[PDB]
Paper text:
Spiroviolene synthase (SvS) from Streptomyces violens was first described by Rabe et al. and represents a bacterial class I diterpene cyclase that we were not able to produce in sufficient quantities for crystallization due to protein instability. Terpene cyclases such as SvS form a variety of complex multicyclic compounds with potent biological activities via carbocationic, electrophilic cyclization cascades of relatively simple substrates, either by metal-ion assisted release of an allylic pyrophosphate (class I mechanism) or by protonation of an oxirane/ene-functionality (class II mechanism). We previously reported a hypothetical ancestor of SvS—SvS-A2 26—which shares 77% sequence identity with the extant enzyme.
Residue numbers in the entry:
A (entry chain B): 8 to 86, 96 to 231, 240 to 310, 325 to 358
B (entry chain A): 7 to 231, 240 to 309, 325 to 357
């Protein structure tokens, strides 16, 4: 119901329409889609538009295209029993890490191995490893989500946020920023806990803005209605306060970290911000005047009570 | 009828192994990881300090060898109570949630246990790793850890279904499920020798690491001799007798160790000091895994490999890139 708090930079790659054209071509020739109907559904995600908002100045069009292809792949992959899914997650992950892996008629594997080949031609082995690890973390979150559903386990807030941090696909999406820009972030800066907390907070906000398409009954609203005995409206109210409070922490930690940051880490952080805005904006649009909340619905500087898995995001002692 | 192991690698053990084992035994008693005295004695009897003292035998800091040794105890204990034997060993849906809760606890110190006695123990190990490892080395460990849990989740999925994976899926799965990724990723932590990203992530070093892990895994399948292991896989998929499968298994394991030795000899000369140390660790680890498996008494080793082919293994495309030098 209420308008989104997002005081972050909005921009989109100027060559977005050219990337999109090539991406529609790759989707058609990729084998990942059985019928015309399924290819139109994938094309209709507008994933080139989505990702062009994450890396709006990427110098290499090919880089943007490759990264964009994976966002199309991820929406096509998302669209299985836990036991089979755990095997499928293992095979798909192996194919990403081993080019000699063979498809065995699985329609997703050749397409991901084509994305991986492209990533290997542009990115350092280091950047490829970051993407590989982010990819496994997303697959873990999806395995967790499919598990809860098969059992009829509605997770509490803490488990839901931990799981949705992985299952929403934000880890692999944000790990593509460097591959798209070419700006290699040194280990010493990338793995600073402060930078990990910023990455996870960007991911968590994009995930909660995606949930907002209550229009998978494992979502923040279901979780709060089931565990707090709230109505839908009391839960939309409570979800917005949680989310706004996370993005308020992100802006605060970002302003403490940005000043000292080198060129490559600065580009990456601008990416986090472009991606949070891009994610909210793309969700609302998929050129109408959009209204944005000028102010957060909850301004508390404190950790979320009930969510101890994310409280370290607020512990400055632990982030230095 | 069990042929001796081909392992012409350096066997060595930390001179302070007994001092570290004593501290390890006391941590175990205080950890809360063990419900009963029978469990404490089971975990102590793994001799995991002996095990990892063979992986990092010149570790300058005893506290680093202790912390990495604790995770080896933890791993045996978590494998035996939550992965291999209890209600979760055929309940992938419940395991996927545990894998998620444990992995999150490793990455987030503010995480709460929720009635899990394995979690506070892991968090203590994690606190140790963050006290003296770099954030980079901690992330290398965290990522290796999730990789191992994904293998176990795959394995448990296969078990619930009574699905016997083919050779390709079994080697892919077992590369993860046998716990070699997070075991080998603790070398740097024990040792203190931080390997730069550009060296660590080199396809050649990744392949040497996978090969080290795959030999240790198949040495572990041998040590344990329906069940998903190399022997049941070859018996089911090639219609072999146990005896033919034991011989086929030794052959393919020996082929992988030969490629590892061959790639090692090409990479080692140019390696800087930290990558050299890491490499030595892979070698010490393969041998130490095999040797700890067979235990005072004289051990017999095979002098020659049972198969000397220099090409990729038939029926396992997922590992063929270990032999592709243009890619490495």
């Amino acid at each position: 119901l209420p308008p989104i708090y997002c005081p972050l930079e909005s921009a989109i790659h100027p060559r977005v329409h050219e990337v999109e054209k090539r991406a529609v071509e790759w989707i058609r020739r990729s084998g990942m889609c059985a019928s015309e109907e399924e290819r139109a559904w994938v094309i209709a995600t507008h994933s080139a538009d989505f990702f062009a908002r994450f890396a709006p100045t990427a110098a290499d069009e090919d880089r943007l295209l490759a990264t964009s292809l994976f966002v199309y792949w991820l929406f096509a992959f998302d669209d299985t029993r836990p036991a089979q899914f755990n095997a499928l997650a293992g095979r798909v992950q192996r194919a990403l890490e081993a080019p000699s892996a063979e498809d065995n008629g699985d329609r997703f594997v050749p397409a991901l191995q084509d994305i991986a080949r492209r990533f290997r031609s542009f990115g350092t082995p280091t950047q490829v490893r970051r993407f590989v690890h982010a990819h496994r973390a997303w697959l873990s979150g999806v395995a967790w989500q499919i598990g809860n559903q098969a059992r009829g386990h509605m997770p509490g807030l803490d488990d839901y946020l931990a799981m949705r941090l992985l299952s929403a696909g934000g880890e692999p999406t944000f790990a593509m920023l460097e591959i798209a820009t070419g700006a290699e972030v040194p280990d010493r800066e990338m793995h600073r806990p402060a930078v990990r907390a910023l990455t996870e907070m960007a991911i968590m906000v994009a995930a909660l803005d995606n949930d907002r398409h209550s229009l998978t009954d494992q979502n923040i609203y279901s979780v709060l209605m089931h565990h707090r005995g709230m109505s839908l409206q009391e839960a939309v109210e409570e979800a917005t306060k949680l989310r706004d409070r996370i993005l308020l922490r992100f802006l605060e930690l970002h302003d403490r970290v940005r000043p000292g940051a080198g060129a490559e880490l600065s580009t990456y952080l601008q990416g986090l911000r472009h991606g949070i805005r891009g994610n909210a904006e793309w969700g609302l649009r998929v050129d109408a005047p959009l209204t944005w909340a000028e102010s957060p619905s909850d301004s508390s500087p404190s950790p979320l009570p009930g969510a101890p898995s994310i409280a370290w995001w607020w512990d400055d002692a632990l982030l230095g």
